[PDB]
RNA sequence: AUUCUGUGAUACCUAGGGGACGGGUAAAGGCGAAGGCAAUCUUUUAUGUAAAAACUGACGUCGAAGGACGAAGGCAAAGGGAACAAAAAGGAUUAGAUACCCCAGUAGUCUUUGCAGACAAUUAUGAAUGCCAUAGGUUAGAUUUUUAAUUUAGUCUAUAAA
RNA sequence: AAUAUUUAUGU
């Protein structure tokens, strides 16, 4: 500011003030939230070895397939549900 | 008459750029005379050294999407006559 | 009356699930030692 | 931008015709002193548009 | 004015705690080791937590919880030691200092690209 | 956003676990139990009001285990006409 | 030349279904949820019956006969099929009373669809000549246009501003060309109207070197100009220089089909009162109380707001089954996207007390025993 | 070509914003090219402090400039301002689709609106 | 007179529990106030109608709004993905470039939202400052 | 364990210098003859795709050889040298351990100019043309009563006849 | 949720 300046670094972002309607309990709960959100313990996972591109790629892909199965089973068991209700 | 389509169309922006160069700066007196009378310390509400504080933030996308669910308001006249006005100029072609 | 009938469950959801939520609140709350 | 001289001199001609300050359809309620300042100030600022244009739409400022 | 920092940097083998004055100079700066936790004993979740204690009862030596209004925690790396001092300053240790606290931030370095990292290892 | 793919043919669409299972609600006292000892002491009084509570949980009677879920019924059901089919 | 198995299909009742007509439109830039959905405003799908005699064996004139479960016991039996045989080989339907009922209830307040007007309540009826109509012809001047509501063209202020812009690239831009021949014919006008009186003491419609006359003399007048190329676009009139131009017009008839009568200017008469000052109160149920500002309140399956005027201000879980306040319904109309507003008005008491007495929910009855 | 430039010089004198924007608008016109606005923002936080030219910068003085020039002028205009030890850095960029639709709907530098193309 | 507020610290509790927000001309049937569809079953506010097409702005020739760029990426400064977005895959990678083009230009941060912008949201009095040291 | 540290390390900061790397977005996604290609601005470069008209009028496909391009590693010369790391060497493990693991570490990876031409250089499937029934996704367009349906050129699952 | 001691032989 005016008299002392930000300090304008990579923790910034990743900062969370206590307020009246915010514990400090409560501040940890969003730092946990978005810190998982953003995958930064993921990432320091990945990055502790090096990961050439065809492994990172085909590991990828086996991931991203993992995700649809998934996401695509989740939908058949609500739809699935949806149709008992109707009495099918 | 297909390409003379393309051919008005293609007068369409002329024409608008014609319209539009009355702010532009084709010579050093207009460019002078601009910068001297922007470019003065005391112009940001000045107190204020930036534009954030005489216009506090640049537009955002909650500021953009209330003005189409948020209000709909008195504004509906305010900018009807901006659309209003644009219908006309692309039937017409002649800039009201 | 039928829409009586139905406000009351969501009483009882509500006052149920309120409980849950202000006894997680006492078990977040460290209290392990008092002094 | 796909144009040459007598599409763009033509879309100069159009702009300004459709520009010019209409005068009074009477002649006893209009006074020069506005009329011909707004012959002066079309006409100047005319001439800016055909200067700023002709730079805009010149060959030799464009790209490969 | 910037409040006082409590950085917890925390990896699979060790835990550091340092608390540092508003110009971010260390005022306690202590780790695992320290409590005389040898090689290996310095990477369990106790280890960390007694740590904390250490460190939070330090403080009340040297006067500090009168002395810091305002204070942040920092955390960095995602080993034992970040849930354990965190359960010291949220427990009865840190009753005094819990008020203090105004921020909470996390400063775990990553890198984008950067330099390139070990091989893979081959365990099996 | 793409939306959930259809699955491809499997040869049996069923969920490896029906039933939720219950986190035993004991050794979340237990847990509770062993962070007073470690900030106070092992014999100290601050510790009585949660060790009860431990005490009262073992002489509880375990609850009765919940019905059996009939989900993979149903998935069986409509297994052929929710994916693309089935197969083997 | 169509045979007579296609010229029964024409006729049949299962291909007069209409189609499902678009969801009551929302504000496009705003969050929604993404599985969970309630009932709509209006209805999209038609809703279906069948006789006592046929729905204890699941026959609904359909591609099969639904569950027996989910379908009989109800009083009423309606039904909404969103698709008659889905990929599941299965009728995809849903229970129909949500917004069958939701119909029975409000024509079962007797109250008519008036137009709104901005704030003498003077109510004027939708089902009127002199407003409702579609049909016009290009002697129509912009003074009739304000008593249409079905326009063709868009609403200006509605339109996102994408919207607009593709609306000028693809209907407005390619009628430049009609557009001249629409002033030649008022030019045609231009012309004889100096023969006025030439008669007393058309042309051909064809000049390109008049059009071009008219249109330079307009540029100094704009509102003039935007009145001539609103009748050409069918655009809703939006400024001042009055059919409710501010929220735009009803992308619906007025009255929506909800309920046709034209007036509320009729005495209910009382067995045995008489004639009875104001219309049978309903009880409204209470939805967000003010203590998020603001009440609401269900009345007949609809939400309006709380009347002008307490179990709104704050909530109360003492109260069974909710709170529950008497109420008259003053004045009804459907809103420019779709919604049926209601302007709701609290209700007296005495009124409360006479509809009670024939329920016999009334503790003191009015009748014989009042003593004064 | 139409392109614009955001420079970022030092701040506390206004001297040498003026004689920036005016040894790269006179450039631009001498050149054969046309300003169409100079917009003068203040003085703000930067990205992050930086250390130019033996100084370490935590706030500059930002200034947009949209103008139609030959590539020649605009590489000779961002070269010259690189060069001057003044500006803490630039940040040059094409504008449009190269199309004359999209070109002729680019006005003055907008603050509360957007870029409508 | 705690015994006022007392009733309220249970009004609000219960009203937080009406998962809906409640407008005019909403139609609503007796199982719309049933548990299941209070309990507001929906996992995801997601984003609808393609808020770039629908707002008719190229994304690339708008690099120098920081609120815009602001609002497409987390705190952390990590773009959002296309369900957070809600954008067709051809808006989301021009807005995604057009965050890759002002962090790369150096006008605006790569870990975090703008300096200027985080004066104004909350934690204004207390953001991290830098202490001359000397 | 070798090793770093009282010549003050690790940890927390301030101020400068120096190299290569490319987080999110990111997808069954896209682009080139292939090899291969993922931060960013400007400059520059050949194909390809959609819709409408217009134009040339068989001008087409394949293609020995020659020539050109061709991953990583490598040779050669001049630079660079943070990080990683063949080799060489040391510490452990082990019956022994060149090895797998660890402390360190030179060529080399990077820039520029040449040589070299070998790959699971793969879709284990040469290129191209005509033709054969459907379904569910997905990529870039077009049309429409643009809500949702038709449609052109790609790509990917599951099938019919075969 | 990112754990990791050692296991040779069998006309
Ligand atoms: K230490
Ligand atoms: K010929
Ligand atoms: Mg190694
Ligand atoms: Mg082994
Ligand atoms: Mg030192
Ligand atoms: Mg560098
Ligand atoms: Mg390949
Ligand atoms: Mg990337
Ligand atoms: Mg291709
Ligand atoms: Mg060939
Ligand atoms: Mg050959
Ligand atoms: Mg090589
Ligand atoms: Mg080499
Ligand atoms: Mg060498
Ligand atoms: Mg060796
Ligand atoms: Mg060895
Ligand atoms: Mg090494
Ligand atoms: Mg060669
Ligand atoms: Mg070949
Ligand atoms: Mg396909
Ligand atoms: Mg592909
Ligand atoms: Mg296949
Ligand atoms: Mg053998």
Redesign the pocket.
Known sequence: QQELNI?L?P?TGRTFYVSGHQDFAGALKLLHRTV?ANKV???V?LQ?F?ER?ALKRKR??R???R??FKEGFKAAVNRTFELKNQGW | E?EAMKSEARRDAVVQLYVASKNFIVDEKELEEHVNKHFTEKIHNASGRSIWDSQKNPISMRELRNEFSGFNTTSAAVKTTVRQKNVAEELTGGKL | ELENKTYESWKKWATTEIARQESARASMYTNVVDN | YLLNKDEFDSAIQYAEHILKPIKAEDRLTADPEKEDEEAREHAARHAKAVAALERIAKLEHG?? | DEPY?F?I?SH?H?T???V?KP????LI?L?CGNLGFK?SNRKHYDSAYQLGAYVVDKMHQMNLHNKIKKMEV?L?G?GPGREAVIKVLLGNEGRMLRSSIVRVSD?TR??????????????? | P??P??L??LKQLRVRQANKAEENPCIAVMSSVLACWASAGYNSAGCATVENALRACMDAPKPAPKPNNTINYHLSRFQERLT??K?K | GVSPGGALLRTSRMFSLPP???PPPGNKLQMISERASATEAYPTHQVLTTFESSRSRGDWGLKRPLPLKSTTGTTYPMVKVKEMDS?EQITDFTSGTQHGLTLKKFQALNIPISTPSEIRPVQRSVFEADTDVTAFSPDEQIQEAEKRWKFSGPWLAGMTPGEFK?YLA?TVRPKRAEFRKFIQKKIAAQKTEAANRELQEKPESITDDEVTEYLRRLRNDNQVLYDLVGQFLDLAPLKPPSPYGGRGPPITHPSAGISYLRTAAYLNNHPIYGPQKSHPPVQARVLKPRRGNDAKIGVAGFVADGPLGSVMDKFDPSIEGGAKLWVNVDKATVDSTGRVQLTVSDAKATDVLIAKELIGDAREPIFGSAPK | ?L?ETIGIVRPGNIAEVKELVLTAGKLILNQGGVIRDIKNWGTFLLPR?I?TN???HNRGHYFVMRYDAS?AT??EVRRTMKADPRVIRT????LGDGKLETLSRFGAIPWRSLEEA | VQELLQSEVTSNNYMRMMRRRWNNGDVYAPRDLSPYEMKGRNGGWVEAADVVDELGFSP?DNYRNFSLISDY??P???????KETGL???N??K???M???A???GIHP??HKHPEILKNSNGRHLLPL??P??
């Open positions: 300090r670094r923790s998982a313990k993921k990432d996972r502790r090096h591109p990828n892909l991931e991203r397939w995700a649809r | 297909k | 790209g490969a | 920092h950085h940097y699979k060790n550091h705690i340092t540092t110009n971010r100079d260390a700066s780790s090689k920092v960095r995602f400063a990553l890198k984008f690209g950067g330099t390139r990292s070990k091989k893979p290892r081959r365990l099996g | 793409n939306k793919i259809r491809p043919p693309q089919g197969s | 499902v007509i678009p990929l593709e693809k | 070509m392109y402090p250390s033996q100084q370490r590539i605009h590489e940040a040059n960029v094409k | 690339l990426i987390t952390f400064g990590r773009i959002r993905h296309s067709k895959p051809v989301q990678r807005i995604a470039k965050v890759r083009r962090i790369g230009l790569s870990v830098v202490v040291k000397g």
